[PDB]
Ligand binder design. Sequence first.
Ligand SMILES: O=P(O)(O)O[C@H]1O[C@H](CO)[C@@H](O)[C@H](O)[C@H]1O
Ligand SMILES: [Mg+2]
Length: 449
Amino acid sequence: HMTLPAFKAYDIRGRVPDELNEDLARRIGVALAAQLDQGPVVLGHDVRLASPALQEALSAGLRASGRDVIDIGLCGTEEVYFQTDYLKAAGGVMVTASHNPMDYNGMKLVREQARPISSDTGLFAIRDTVAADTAAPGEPTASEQSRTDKTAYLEHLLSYVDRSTLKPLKLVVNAGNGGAGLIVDLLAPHLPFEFVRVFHEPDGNFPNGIPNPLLPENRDATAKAVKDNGADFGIAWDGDFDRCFFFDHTGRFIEGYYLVGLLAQAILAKQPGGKVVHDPRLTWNTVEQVEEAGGIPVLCKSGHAFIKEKMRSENAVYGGEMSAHHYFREFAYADSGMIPWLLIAELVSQSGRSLADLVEARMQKFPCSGEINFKVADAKASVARVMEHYASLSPELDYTDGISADFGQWRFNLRSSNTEPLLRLNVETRGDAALLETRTQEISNLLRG
Ligand SMILES: O=P(O)(O)O[C@H]1O[C@H](CO)[C@@H](O)[C@H](O)[C@H]1O
Ligand SMILES: [Mg+2]
């Protein structure tokens, strides 16, 4: 292997100990110090068994390079984002494995204002430094401070809702033995909600499976809890809870697409006329709901780094991806798995409408395929077959992010993943479920052919 495999497009991601270990972690700390502007570095970690050791190695390398370290301890990814920005630190690293296997771990790195460090914005520079670094470890010349106070973070979360307007909704919450439960419990004394706690305790051994609400078996655990307890709706998170997933009162999982438009309207009620950033995979419903709420929709390439920089350049109040990532301007332009369900709970409380009713007509008006992934022998040839087949229909074509083709009553986006060697397909139609299925199956056949 010519270069270190753990260094991916957006983050560091690999098997312990051959792709990621304490030695590499320490070298990464040293290299990161050379890439940042002045200031301390915030460090946090998730519930994985190896994460504290990796964070300590990271701290050792940073402090050997004269960087003060602010250890915010066991946390969610968004807390590293928030505290980095809030404390005006030089940068931050979250040690997390997200939903990777048990023998895996990783790191998400940010600089000032929690601005992402990605492959083309410092991460491969870090990789190359680490790759060539054979120097003996130096000793720490800077200190580490423990800062586990979450008051500022919690106040920021609560600032998104008028607590006097909240109703005592019954909410299922499913941390999947990740870290989300700790924050829910800290918020609960300040909320009127009745919580039904599922897989609630943090446990890096993951007795009920690695947190991933998109897997049907994991999905059903939240769904069952909602139905059995007559909950208003249910929320589940991934391990580092920067992704949230919603289940209405019938137990039905709500496709992430529709929450972009819903959350946009929620935010626009608080910040009128604002711009809203969205990705190009699924678009029609978002554009319509944003515009109807008096907002301005802004098309952007998918990927958190693209989304965040677009929001910054546009002073956008909110950004959302169909892949369950939701970004908020005052939250350091960063994603949160907590702010969205607070906003939705407030929406349900104030409107008297169920989460089901809030999205029902939208799902009927703009039905989507869901993201469908393809691993084929020749991605480029497969894309060519699709485009050649639809040429005679003369679709409107857009190349913001792969290929978007607008045929009038239906459209698709076809993308190479930046994080996996996959093709990703998304189809939607104008209120036509039949057209949706036939076109989705047609494209599927073409890609596989
Ligand atoms: O592999 P992709 O599709 O390129 O990228 C995926 O991971 C990114 C970071 O989690 C997300 O921001 C994208 O929305 C998601 O599609
Ligand atoms: Mg995550």
